[PDB]
Design a protein around this ligand. Structure first.
Ligand SMILES: Nc1nc2c(ncn2[C@@H]2O[C@H](COP(=O)(O)OP(=O)(O)O)[C@@H](O)[C@H]2O)c(=O)[nH]1
Lengths: 430, 42
């Protein structure tokens, strides 16, 4: 059951570098590629993320794509950069310019053939292939354009597998790019048709996590990308270690998505402890559950109190009783019954895995499907309508060749997604 | 001023939430003639 990773754009390549550092650490792989681990439990599932090269070495199943190699030169110069296969770096000769049409139509069609040949070679090498995993930002240019182009081509090639994306979405308070509404709207239109499950992260939520919860004095992008790499490596933990209640990406999708358009989820990771307070709180399943449901620990700006949970999933790592997990999930569902959709009798799935991450006694990752995500799309649609009515920057996209009708389709599809969430929020048994 | 997450905590739990450690409990429901005669004779 093998996963293939794709890293696109600056954000994707940097998060991928930190992810492969975390994964190499958990399985005891030296940056030269030699196994130096201390338990057979590490070796027996190494195939899930690594392919074996001759005389001991392991290589990571990842494709790196970008339109200018600057970020790739930074990752190759990094401490673990040597592990990556040289032939897996695909690059052009000019940047995306933060423009969706350029990234999708001009340099996209020029490079895409080499990316599909690398992705097909990597996928076919697996003895049994599980879904793909893609990291990119939706507000950028090569991330949005090449991510959605490659997702569409892989969905044509491998329609029976899973398509999973980790995506960065624009903050509600400060923009990092002026033309964010167009790129976000077109990317969400592409994802709702092509994707099977999509997770969304706001950089503002990670900044507030670092400052309030971890009280870091001088955080850097390495810390934010470490938090993301921790949750990303946590969702797949039950795929690659033994446990009392095994789980799989398809089982999460089957339990989380009630209707095919409603596949956007909130994400969280629980055992974050403040830099000077570990002496004040013991590890226990109730402590993890309490942090698990605290909105301070959620990586999106929308708050659960304005919506209702359709479904949620918790994956536990560590040696613990099943009774405590089941009774905690029952107590949280019974005490807060108004925030759970009433026509579903149980919204939470639990899973338990025996092997925790190194240096932690226990850990859990939380995935939540909540209707409050409709507030983000409504805000993006408002900003899109403000910019489009006045043709604010439209000449770049139209000059590249885009039909204006594409913008009206994407706006209509996002507005219908918001309407569908609002209708399911206020549905009743009668 | 530092920006903040716009979500406030509502959900709360506790350790050992079950009553007496049991998921459920069942209620209490309350609750001839003479024989053959013989002997030595002459
Ligand atoms: N968490 C995180 N966000 C990033 C990182 N680099 C860029 N971003 C964000 O991603 C957006 C910029 O997209 P970018 O990656 O430059 O798009 P590209 O030009 O197509 O590669 C902005 O919101 C940045 O704040 C990173 O290393 N980590």
């Amino acid at each position: 059951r093998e996963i293939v990773c794709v890293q696109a754009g600056q954000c994707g390549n940097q998060i991928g570098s930190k992810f492969w550092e975390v994964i190499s650490d958990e399985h005891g792989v030296d940056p030269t590629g030699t196994y130096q681990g201390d338990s057979d439990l590490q070796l027996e599932r190494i195939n899930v993320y690594f392919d074996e090269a001759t005389g001991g070495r392991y290589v990571p199943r990842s494709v790196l794509i970008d339109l200018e190699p600057g970020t790739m030169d930074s990752v190759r110069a990094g401490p673990y950069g040597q592990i990556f296969r040289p032939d897996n770096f695909i690059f052009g000769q000019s940047g995306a310019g933060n423009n969706w049409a350029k990234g999708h139509y001009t340099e996209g069609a020029e490079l895409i053939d080499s990316v599909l040949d690398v992705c097909c070679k990597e996928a076919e090498s697996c003895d049994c292939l599980q879904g793909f995993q893609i990291c990119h930002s939706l507000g950028g240019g090569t991330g949005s354009g090449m991510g959605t182009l490659l997702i569409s081509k892989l969905r044509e090639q491998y329609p029976d597998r899973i398509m999973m994306t980790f995506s960065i979405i624009p903050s509600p308070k400060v923009s990092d790019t002026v033309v964010e509404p167009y790129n976000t709207t077109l990317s969400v239109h592409q994802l709702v048709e092509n994707s099977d499950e999509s997770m969304c992260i706001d950089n503002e939520a990670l900044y507030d996590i670092c400052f309030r919860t971890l009280k870091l004095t001088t955080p850097t992008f390495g810390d934010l990308n470490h938090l993301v790499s921790a949750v990303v490596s946590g969702v797949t933990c039950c795929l690659r270690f033994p446990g009392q209640l095994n789980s799989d990406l398809r089982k999460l999708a089957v339990n989380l998505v009630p209707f095919p358009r409603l596949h956007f989820f909130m994400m969280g990771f629980a055992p974050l402890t403040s830099r000077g307070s570990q002496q004040y709180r013991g590890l226990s399943v109730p402590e993890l559950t309490q942090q698990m449901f605290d909105a301070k620990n959620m990586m999106q700006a929308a708050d659960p109190r304005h919506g209702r949970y359709l479904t949620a999933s918790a994956l536990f790592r560590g040696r613990m009783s099943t009774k405590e997990v089941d009774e905690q999930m029952l107590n949280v569902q019974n005490k807060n019954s108004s925030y759970f959709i009433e026509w579903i009798p149980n919204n939470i799935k639990s899973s338990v895995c025996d092997i925790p991450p190194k240096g932690l006694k226990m850990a859990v990752t939380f995935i939540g499907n909540n209707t409050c995500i409709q507030e983000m799309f409504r805000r993006v649609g408002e900003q899109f309508t403000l910019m489009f009515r006045r043709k604010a920057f439209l000449h770049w996209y139209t000059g590249e060749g885009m039909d204006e009708m594409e913008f009206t389709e994407a706006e209509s599809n996002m507005n219908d997604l918001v309407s569908e969430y609002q209708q399911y929020q206020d549905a009743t048994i009668e | 001023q530092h920006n903040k997450h716009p979500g406030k905590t509502v959900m709360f739990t506790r350790k050992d939430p079950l009553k007496r450690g049991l998921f459920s409990s069942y209620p209490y429901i309350p609750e001839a003639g003479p024989n053959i005669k013989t002997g030595k004779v002459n």
